[PDB]
Design a protein around this ligand. Structure first.
Ligand SMILES: CC(=O)N[C@@H]1[C@@H](O)[C@H](O[C@@H]2O[C@H](CO)[C@@H](O[C@@H]3O[C@H](CO[C@H]4O[C@H](CO[C@H]5O[C@H](CO)[C@@H](O)[C@H](O)[C@@H]5O[C@H]5O[C@H](CO)[C@@H](O)[C@H](O)[C@@H]5O)[C@@H](O)[C@H](O[C@H]5O[C@H](CO)[C@@H](O)[C@H](O)[C@@H]5O[C@H]5O[C@H](CO)[C@@H](O)[C@H](O)[C@@H]5O)[C@@H]4O)[C@@H](O)[C@H](O[C@H]4O[C@H](CO)[C@@H](O)[C@H](O)[C@@H]4O[C@H]4O[C@H](CO)[C@@H](O)[C@H](O)[C@@H]4O[C@H]4O[C@H](CO)[C@@H](O)[C@H](O)[C@@H]4O)[C@@H]3O)[C@H](O)[C@H]2NC(C)=O)[C@@H](CO)O[C@H]1O
Ligand SMILES: CC(=O)N[C@@H]1[C@@H](O)[C@H](O[C@@H]2O[C@H](CO)[C@@H](O[C@@H]3O[C@H](CO[C@H]4O[C@H](CO[C@H]5O[C@H](CO)[C@@H](O)[C@H](O)[C@@H]5O[C@H]5O[C@H](CO)[C@@H](O)[C@H](O)[C@@H]5O)[C@@H](O)[C@H](O[C@H]5O[C@H](CO)[C@@H](O)[C@H](O)[C@@H]5O[C@H]5O[C@H](CO)[C@@H](O)[C@H](O)[C@@H]5O)[C@@H]4O)[C@@H](O)[C@H](O[C@H]4O[C@H](CO)[C@@H](O)[C@H](O)[C@@H]4O[C@H]4O[C@H](CO)[C@@H](O)[C@H](O)[C@@H]4O[C@H]4O[C@H](CO)[C@@H](O)[C@H](O)[C@@H]4O)[C@@H]3O)[C@H](O)[C@H]2NC(C)=O)[C@@H](CO)O[C@H]1O
Lengths: 264, 264
């Protein structure tokens, strides 16, 4: 397949509809949009899925804040992030793993989402009486979600206990390099180049169009399958994306004019 | 990197040591020798690696039948072939893929081999209740094996479900054109010319030396990186190989006199 553009939107600040305002070759520039993020939270022995008031609002208003992206062909994923309780993706027991995977699959079904993204950061492993080290639950969680959501996408931000995931990487559609604005010509957890983004642009502290065209052209020539983006804002950042369009796609990217505020 | 000579030996018939008897520029003429072939066999739900008595004899006698080739700098790969059970590289489920990848990696480690060659032929897909069509496992099998045996070689004979392998071709060192004694100036699964043999000689039903020199010169001048060979026997076939040496390498090939019988 062609190179996919995968964007994480910090929905505490930014209306995710802005991802749809960018066009390349009569199609959306962005292929995947990650609502960053819902949280795993340990609560006693339970492994819970927690949506903060901004995420919950977007899910509660899926017809107006998610579906128009999906109407254009964009796949919308629920981002998943640690949240300082001491329990994260990599230190659950068998019951907690099954419980968390059930919650996530039910949320993806209930809100008509296209899958999920895993970002193993900020769990603060070991706090509040949970194990301080890995139990092996991270691979089992991927496996459980693959069995529960056939046909849906799983992406992994390459940070935290991801080195453990090599054995289940056939269940993972894309991996994403964790540092911004400079490429690293490798992949994590054994992913082939065609399933990895070795270059990830911070669109808030944005690099120049010249740098984006330089590196995006190298993404294509070296045969990688994706480019990552983090923290798209509500300003028109097409200068940078047009650099990527010229570099990786031999094309151009334009703005449709729609700037969507976060009135919630 | 110069042109590599890659030879498949039908070890049901031929002692593989014969590949070491040919010399070009004070080095082995052949760079890779494939022991053709171990098999994938479905047994119930298991995906198994089966070595027939000739293959198993060679592996059990690695010090006398494999190591002398490796001492000369020749790389020796285990050939992998379907075997009429209905299960093959391209129709496994995830557990079978992991299971077969593990069995192959372990044999490569146990017998001190330099890697493997995949020939997706003779599986008879769909026999014995196995899936009749592709599951997508061929690409995952290459990924799983690359991750399990780092620093080893993977070659792919361009026959069977190989059109699926474009996404993992960075894990494949060489692809081999599947038909004999006439070049086809293209490659499979997105491979660059430098990683492909577009010309494969049958050394049993051998072409003329003049033919071999004509076509091998075109291999070099068109920028390809390998030439393939099938069914080297125990007779002195240097006349053909010297034709290739004159064509592709602007040199000569000689025989060292050693004819090794299959007394096993
Ligand atoms: C160090 C380093 O660098 N590191 C790195 C990393 O970082 C990375 O990662 C990646 O990347 C990215 C970027 O970087 C990231 O992101 C980021 O993050 C961060 C962090 O976060 C986290 O944490 C936090 C905190 O927490 C704490 O606190 C809180 C409050 O208080 C609480 O609550 C909690 O719980 C905690 O606490 C606890 O703990 C502690 C400690 O232990 C203790 O002490 C206590 O006591 C307790 O216990 C948090 O908050 C978060 O979370 C949140 O969010 C999320 C999303 O993100 C979600 O999911 C969740 O849910 C949450 O949300 C919710 O909540 C909140 C709170 O409450 C609210 O607000 C909301 O609304 C909701 O409701 C986490 O966990 C951070 O910080 C950041 O942020 C930033 O950015 C953003 C975007 O843009 C924004 O929005 C914000 O605001 C901020 O801003 C800032 O910065 C920026 C940038 O530049 C700018 O623009 C602005 O302007 C600002 O600035 C300012 O400030 C700064 C500082 O602050 C300075 O510098 C400047 O100058 C100025 O001043 C971000 O977000 C991420 O994560 C990642 N990514 C992915 C995964 O994809 C890595 C990799 O790359 O690497 C490393 O190296
Ligand atoms: C058609 C066409 O053409 N096609 C093509 C193809 O072929 C190709 O491919 C490629 O190339 C090459 C060449 O061609 C190849 O190779 C070949 O192959 C073939 C086949 O094989 C396969 O199959 C077989 C059969 O099977 C069956 O049977 C058996 C017995 O009985 C059984 O066991 C089985 O199972 C099966 O059965 C089953 O199934 C069936 C069907 O379905 C049914 O019916 C039944 O009932 C059952 O169920 C087989 O056998 C094989 O296998 C084997 O081998 C392998 C190696 O190769 C291994 O791996 C395995 O393991 C095995 O071995 C084992 O076993 C056996 C048996 O038992 C024994 O014996 C041994 O020892 C061990 O143990 C497969 O699978 C074949 O046939 C061929 O062969 C031939 O050659 C060789 C070499 O040189 C030799 O050695 C032999 O012997 C033969 O010989 C012959 O021929 C030749 C020439 O070649 C000559 O020289 C001689 O002399 C002879 O002749 C004779 O005969 C003929 C006929 O045969 C006639 O013609 C004449 O005249 C005379 O008489 C070969 O091998 C390959 O494969 C590939 N390559 C690669 C690299 O891959 C493609 C491509 O090119 O194309 C297409 O087109």
């Amino acid at each position: 397949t062609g190179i996919k553009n995968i964007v994480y939107i910090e929905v505490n600040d930014i209306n995710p509809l802005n991802a749809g305002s960018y066009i390349m070759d009569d199609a959306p520039f962005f292929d995947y949009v990650i609502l960053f993020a819902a949280n795993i939270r340990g609560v006693g022995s339970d492994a819970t899925l927690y949506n903060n008031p901004n995420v919950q609002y977007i899910l509660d208003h899926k017809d107006t804040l998610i579906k128009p992206l999906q109407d254009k062909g964009i796949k919308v994923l629920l981002g998943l992030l640690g949240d300082h309780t001491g329990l994260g993706f990599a230190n659950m027991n068998s019951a907690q793993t099954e419980q968390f995977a059930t919650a996530v699959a039910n949320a993806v079904s209930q809100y008509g989402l296209d899958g999920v993204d895993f970002a193993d950061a900020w769990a603060e492993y070991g706090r509040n009486g949970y194990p301080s080290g890995s139990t092996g639950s991270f691979s089992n969680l991927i496996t459980a979600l693959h069995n529960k959501m056939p046909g849906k996408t799983i992406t992994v931000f390459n940070y935290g206990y991801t080195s453990e995931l090599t054995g289940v990487n056939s269940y993972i559609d894309y991996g994403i390099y964790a540092f911004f604005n400079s490429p690293s010509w490798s992949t994590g957890f054994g992913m082939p180049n065609s399933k990895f983004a070795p270059y990830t642009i911070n669109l808030n502290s944005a690099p120049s169009a010249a740098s984006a065209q330089l590196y995006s052209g190298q993404v294509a020539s070296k045969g990688y399958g994706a480019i990552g983006y983090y923290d798209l804002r509500a300003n028109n950042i097409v200068s940078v994306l047009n650099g990527v369009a010229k570099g990786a796609f031999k094309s151009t990217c334009t703005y449709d004019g729609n700037s969507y505020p976060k009135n919630y």
